[model samples]
Target: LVHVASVEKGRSYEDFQKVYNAIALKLREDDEYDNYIGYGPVLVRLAWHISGTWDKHDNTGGSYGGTYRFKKEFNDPSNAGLQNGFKFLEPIHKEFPWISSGDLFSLGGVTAVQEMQGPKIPWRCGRVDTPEDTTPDNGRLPDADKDAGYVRTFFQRLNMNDREVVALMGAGALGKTHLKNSGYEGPWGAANNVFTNEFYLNLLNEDWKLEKNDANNEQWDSKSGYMMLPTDYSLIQDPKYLSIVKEYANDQDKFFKDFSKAFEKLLENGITFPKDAPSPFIFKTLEEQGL
Candidate 1:
């Protein structure tokens, strides 16, 4: 609720539409990262990490303050490899200087999820930039090296319930953790960039090995060269999380619907929306618009 005298203005719908086109065009051009998986997955992860910092009780950390773009937050150990996502957006930031850093970063995530055939994430405007000191301290992000009980306790600080935590982690299955980046390695699915219930399906169906990675951290590995963090694999180990996992794995439409709702809630964790504020806006994908 720290309203600034100089609130960073957001782009209008039409202006953002143009910004969307710019992001779309760049996604097509920069299709070479992560063995050609492109920047989509990491960008989504960036948005998740930014908003994931919120502690509901204190109301101090959240997406409303776009401080992740700063050096301290960017250098966070949990955010080890996200610089690639930030680097990926530097050109876009240059091209559309009018957009707030918060808006550009979050919009990049929305564009990635939608373009990759995931659910349409409804987005809003009005995130304003604060000083670098506003950045949340390190360790605000969830540890990948944890279990179901740990994951549950950790997310509660952010006000996420059991169902929301499961759905949010489903997104982790969309991207890999690099040994260099996260002290872990391997893709979570065959179509990592193209979002699907593949994460849940793999968790339920794949025969996994709990082996030590090169970094000496243990993660569940599959024959397909995919891996899951302890937290990711814990979805099936715990009955309650397993039930939601089965629900999403068995039904694609339900997964998309629930994920859309949960992911939006994750991104907009803090900040008060006016009672009469507009509903979430769903943007058309490049293909949907016949671009």
Candidate 2:
């Protein structure tokens, strides 16, 4: 059950950067997707879904094993609509076939976030693909229809604290939720592609009304046409989570820093890296490189 970090043979930061650049470039070129919301949000979701399967109790399912390539994991009911991200990475994988599936999936999120003007998430490579039997069963992912207690308890399995939970949920600001995909609908804010603390701000400022969607799902809808999953709204419902949410809403830089750390940790869960492993790579955004 011990998954060790094994760097891809003869690959270094520059190697991964090439993969990152490809993903970033395609993200810009593929503008017609999800009604022009772009592939950023779904890419982040795919990374989270692939990594979120880790169980601290046993460390069985996680980013270490690129088992999402398998049918069961790809067809995960919780993973519906993520095929877009997998498909999007298809060309990149073909061009750089040596890159592991988990590395490519996780790197897609890193590139999307940075290109969307989010924080710099230092990433590491080496997740080798495991056999199909290694893929964890579905239903391990969290449910959208839940409350604060459920949200807190669900993340406990992943070893994430209240601050990390609040910080990660800030991603809800990106992209709109399609009713067809998750029985929920609407963007959390006006600028869906750009990463911001707006999810926290809107959670605190918006006039959210409890209503049911066409899917008969109870969600908090705002007059501004934004919506919040019960689980997302729970951040403000719980006293402790609300405090962190408020803090993030007030400080954008702080939220970005905390999110970068938490997200990297989430993706790195269940894998042990030796001291000799090269330092994590803090990639420069394409904008930073003027590319």
Candidate 3:
């Protein structure tokens, strides 16, 4: 099953940049959602959830198919609370109906990260929507209630290495988890809306205590009003993951670059891009364009 990248008819960088601008503007304007955390973090999560379903063994699931818009994928238990991200993009999709769902969803994350002062994630276009039956089943996303071993094993299916795992987990710094969404709650750091390496910093620096939440879930809670899911705490517990976590905590630039690459790789998984396909597009944020 080879999914080839076919650029939307005549859609060039300029066309995608326009789509990027629309998402960026809406992100800035819609500041009241998620308690003023904005749509940035959830947008990133939306992109991840959509892409994370890939199985490297058979190529059964991935961002290559825009099947998340379907009920089966949309209603996946693991994807709870992402409807907000989907709803956020509805207007942008309406305005630019030509863009594919996979492109719009993945591009939303790139735009959010850049607008929030993170690394430039070069994004590609052309993820033709597959049928609803192509949507992978639920329970493919990783569980937060596990340890270092589980975390390592879970990410293997997605083909992420230890370094890639740590870098991508750095995104935990961007938003708070709500109990209603996943039986977890609290921001990982004070600067929740901004992308940073603080997740690793806090994991190493904070005084964390193992405690059970109201939902009966175990999470590491810090005195500074931050919380780490068990899987998040595992990075510091495992020797190999610990090293990468510390490196990212100490070096912000390295983390940003690594994350940009890993994230693009995550979104691009399971798709075969033709050698003649146009290079990925690195979009400018609203501030960069002086909007």
Candidate 4:
């Protein structure tokens, strides 16, 4: 089956840049969310959660469809707390009223990363919406309780390798889990506002002990009051993943570059870009614009 590709007629780099600015501006204004972590992290997760449903074999449940607008996907248990990001974007979508849901969702992540001083992720735009019947079933997103074997196998569905997996988890450093929401809890590092390889640093350097949280799920808790999910801790346990983890921990620039590539890949998966499609655009952050 061919993947969907629908670019809004007459849209160019300038049009998408306006949308990017809208997201970045609102992000600065919406500072009260998540104890001032802003909507950046959740927006990144929102984009991923929508796109992560893709299966390489069947080519179903990808970001190209933008089916998250439907009730079935919106109500997904795995998608809990994303509604806030959706609500945050509602005004921007209303303001533009032309950009596809898929484009806006993914662009929010790219904008968030660059504005927060993360890597410059190249992004493409052309996802068209599909009917609710096209929405993939629940349980396609990863399980947080699994082991290194399961983590490695699960990412294979998304076509990610050891380096890509390690890099994306570094972006996981920007967000925290609320026990009331995800049955897991705690931030990955001290600063959740900025993107850093601190996750790999925390994994390898901190003296962590496996323990149960208030929700009774097992996670690696550190004396510094940070916690790592079983899946996060799993990185250091595996021989190959552990090696990549150490590599990222040692070199911040390497992690940023790898993350930029992997995140772009994750956003563009399950879509077919035409041979003549414009090269991926790296939007400039507002800071770069002297705004």
Q: TM-score, each model?
A: 0.95, 0.99, 0.99, 0.98
Report residue 184 deviation for candidate 2 (angstroms).
0.4
Model 1 spans > 4 angstroms off:
1-10
Ranking by lDDT: 3, 2, 4, 1
Q: Clashes in model 1: which pairs?
A: none
lDDT of 3: 0.92
List per-prediction Cα lDDT, in the order shown. 0.84, 0.92, 0.92, 0.88
Candidate 1 C-alpha lDDT tens digits along 156-234: 9888899888888898357677889888988899887888888999988888999998899999999887888899999
Which candidate would rank higher by lDDT, 1 or 3?
A: 3
Model 4: CA > 4 A from native: none
> Between prediction 2 and prediction 4, which has the larger TM-score?
2
Candidate 4 residue lDDT tens string, 1-291: 677576789998999999999899999889988988899999999988998998999888878888899889999998999999999999999999999988988898899888778989899988887778997788899988888999889999999998888788778488799998888888999888898889999889899988988888888889998988888889989999999998989998999999999998898988999988888888998888876
Per model, how many backbone clashes are there?
0, 0, 0, 0
Tell me, what's the RMSD of every candidate?
Answer: 1.9, 0.8, 0.7, 0.9
Name the weakest run of 10 consecutive residues (lDDT summed) in model 3: 169-178
